[PDB]
């Protein structure tokens, strides 16, 4: 009971960190039963298949990816929604860089959930901070009055793009200097601030 | 030989997915509005993703010809009114039904992100750039990356084009989409 519990947690946990390094297809479920310290019938009780277990590593890798945003924008110190909105930029390009979440949420995802799966995830954790900084930046006056969703939906494909252009770059380092410098002056264009 | 059934059956398969969707035509029927047998068909493509990366290929292909097309009866008269004009063109010709259903709907579930990407990059990155260049050299553009800043468009429009496919009201995305587009390539550009 509590040990099945603490079984999945461990599950996740190791799943998380053993695709986060070598990649989805690169490591099967027993190896993850072991790192875990639990038997394949507790694990095959918690999680049905491979593609199960992800799932549960997508989500907890996801509300950690908005739970990072949300601290680096409220670490910028951003006084206005404008600033809220730079910083939340520089954020996501900062976020998506982190190693396991290229992996993970760039590389595997897509792949294991497939496309209808992936968006309806991306969507539901991405989609309220967006149109949430959008609508901030109109009520301010620093954007346009506006369709909210349709401009969320556009920002959110084209940082979706700038992410996946660095995680694939011959040269990741310049691609995210040159990537956060083309975004910065989009919004810039469009910020009243 | 082989390329005559290899046409047939792409048409066949462009028309019918088209119509019906990806997930609701077999090849069994794209061999019969071929007019070619199952043997025929399988000896050209080992499955039905086969196919239809050969239908995306011809559909993108035809997609970027009808934008130039737009573009050049647009008579944009500067090249910040050729990029105002290519993502018009862009916005017409992804609400073309076909276009709708096997490059915005059927393609990215069939190819994945990474595929769909490969696709859109293959086909529209050379002209993107070259538009961009052209806007940087009149100065109607800040001197910028434009490898980085020709993705990120892309990116957005494909972005724009299936939000548009998918929406309870299309014609009213189509308008508040396109009204979001014009005023970001407008914060883009300078004068
Ligand atoms: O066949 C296609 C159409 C769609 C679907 C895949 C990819 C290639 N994509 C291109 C979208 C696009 C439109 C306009 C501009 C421009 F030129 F206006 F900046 C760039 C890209």
Redesign the interface.
């Known amino acids: 009971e509590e040990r099945s519990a603490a079984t999945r947690e461990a599950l996740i946990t190791g799943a998380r960190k053993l695709w986060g390094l070598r990649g989805y297809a690169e490591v099967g479920t027993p190896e993850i039963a072991t790192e875990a310290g639990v038997t394949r019938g507790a694990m095959y009780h918690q999680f049905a298949d491979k593609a199960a277990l992800f799932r549960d590593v997508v989500e907890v890798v996801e509300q950690d990816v908005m739970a990072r945003m949300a601290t680096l924008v409220a670490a910028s110190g951003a006084a206005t929604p404008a600033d809220a909105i730079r910083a939340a930029v520089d954020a996501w390009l900062e976020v998506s860089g982190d190693p396991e979440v290229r992996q993970l949420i760039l590389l595997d995802a897509?792949?294991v959930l497939?496309?209808?799966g992936?968006r309806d995830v991306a969507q539901r954790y991405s989609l309220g901070m967006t149109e949430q900084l959008i609508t901030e930046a109109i009520r301010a006056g620093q954007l346009?009055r506006?369709?909210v969703r349709?401009?969320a939906?556009?920002?959110?494909?084209?940082l979706?793009?700038?992410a996946?252009?660095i995680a694939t770059a011959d040269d990741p380092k310049r691609?995210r200097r040159?990537?956060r410098?083309?975004?910065r002056?989009?919004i810039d264009?469009?910020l009243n601030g």
Do not use: Y
């Open positions: 897509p792949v497939g496309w209808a992936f346009a506006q369709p349709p401009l939906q556009v920002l959110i494909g084209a979706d793009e700038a996946m252009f691609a040159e990537t410098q083309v975004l002056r989009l264009g469009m």
